[PDB]
Write a protein that binds this ligand. Structure first.
Ligand SMILES: *[C@@H]1O[C@H](CO)[C@@H](O)[C@H](O)[C@H]1NC(C)=O
Lengths: 201, 117, 106
């Protein structure tokens, strides 16, 4: 049994071992189209808090071929990792990042208190807590328009009954596990009419 | 600005009740709403929380029996108690939630529910 | 998660400074709110974010804290402060209300 050489590895090392991740509301989506997918380099990273695969077998990833692989990356709290799952309700699953009920992919979330936490407070990661409707699956919403909660119209300047819909995780190394930084990568596998170009060695 | 509360009466150990809160000065559709009960002589206990989108969350004791609803035409927030118990006798408060930027800033007057005879 | 509070055995004279302390089981962000409930009345918000004074609330109420330790302070205990004071983690999907502290006049 002989096969052609293994040449074009997919860039999972860039998705996982990134210097900085994106905020939850403006999550980072990376497309993967033409490369042999080595899912064995994922396990080379830190022990994961959550490795949950829906739709496909975790140990049969190299035996499948998909047309596209989407990698969504963000940083959430420790108590919001349960919301990254099909059919969940909460602050993240309704206003920031929604997965479809019939979801095919894998969610990988791991602790990053060493990286994304500062002793004085890491006021960089943001999340949206005010919205007027639940998000559709795989729909982003990047906006800084002042939310309106009262009957009085809100022109666009903050004030009474006028609040910005985004706040920040003030990540600190003295917080509990439920509020530590947690890097989350969601791999979604597409099976469109195009030929399956993401394969496995 | 104002949350006027209505409802609350004696119910049997299996009766169903509905408590209402009419909001003036705020839009119930655009705010988090919370129901918090206080037992007679006890502390404050969180019961229910409805979101602006429509997602509902309940406590472990009241899950499967209580339903928080919202009527948009009358700008009213409802708590429906399908199955009751002697432990549900309390004073219920409907509050506008401003989580992480104020919390429960506006409260209703409270409706008293007694479950006996 | 858990939010323990100092007991209700607080009795101070008029004008005395009163401190009420809240201790979380694990470290939480400074998103703790304080509530003042008079007998037969709904609770009234006092301080949100553990350091921000609510509009219409007298300046005698000062909040300060971080990590696991939070504190409410009444600089002068005027007679209008005979009420139960509750702590509340404002970012808890299941609401977490600590046992209130009953302030009494001696
Ligand atoms: C495949 O890789 C091997 C090992 O480096 C090399 O000897 C061989 O020439 C390669 N074949 C092609 C067609 O590039």
């Amino acid at each position: 049994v002989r096969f052609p050489n293994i040449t074009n590895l997919c860039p999972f090392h860039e998705v996982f071992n990134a210097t900085t991740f994106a905020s939850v509301y403006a999550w980072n989506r990376k497309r993967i189209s033409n490369c042999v997918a080595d899912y064995s380099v994922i396990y080379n990273f830190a022990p994961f808090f959550a490795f949950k695969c829906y739709g496909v077998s975790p140990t049969k990833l190299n035996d499948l071929c998909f047309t596209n692989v989407y990698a969504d990356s963000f940083v959430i709290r420790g108590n919001e990792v349960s919301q990254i799952a099909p059919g969940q309700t909460g602050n993240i699953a309704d206003y920031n990042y929604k997965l479809p009920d019939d979801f095919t992919g894998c969610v990988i979330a791991w602790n990053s208190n060493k990286l994304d936490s500062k002793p004085s407070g890491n006021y960089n990661y943001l999340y949206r807590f005010l919205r007027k409707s639940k998000l559709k699956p795989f729909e982003r919403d990047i906006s800084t328009e002042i939310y309106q909660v009262g009957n009085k119209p809100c022109n666009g300047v903050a004030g009474p009954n006028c609040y910005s819909p985004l706040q920040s995780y003030g990540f600190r190394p003295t917080y509990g596990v439920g509020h530590q930084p947690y890097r989350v990568v969601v791999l979604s596998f597409e099976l469109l009419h195009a030929p399956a170009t993401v394969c496995g060695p | 600005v104002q949350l006027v509360q209505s409802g609350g009466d004696l119910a049997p150990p299996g009766g169903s009740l509905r408590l209402s809160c009419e909001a003036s000065g705020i839009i119930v559709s655009s705010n988090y709403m919370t129901w918090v009960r206080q037992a007679p002589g006890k502390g404050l206990e969180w019961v229910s929380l409805i979101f602006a989108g429509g997602s509902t969350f309940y406590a472990d004791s009241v899950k499967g029996r209580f339903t928080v609803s919202r009527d948009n035409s009358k700008n009213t927030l409802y708590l429906q108690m399908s199955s009751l118990k002697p432990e549900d006798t309390a004073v219920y408060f409907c509050a506008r939630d401003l989580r992480e930027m104020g919390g429960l800033d506006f409260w209703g007057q409270g409706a008293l529910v007694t479950v006996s005879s | 998660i858990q939010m323990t509070q100092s007991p209700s055995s607080v009795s101070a004279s008029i004008g005395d400074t009163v401190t009420i302390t809240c201790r979380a089981s694990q470290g939480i962000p400074s998103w703790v709110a304080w509530y003042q409930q008079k007998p037969g009345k709904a609770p009234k918000l006092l301080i949100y974010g553990a350091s921000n004074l609510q509009r219409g609330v007298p300046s005698r109420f000062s909040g300060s804290g971080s990590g696991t330790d939070f504190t409410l302070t009444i600089s002068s205990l005027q007679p209008e402060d005979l009420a139960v004071y509750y702590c509340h983690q404002s970012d808890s999907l299941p609401g977490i209300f600590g046992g209130g502290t009953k302030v009494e006049i001696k």
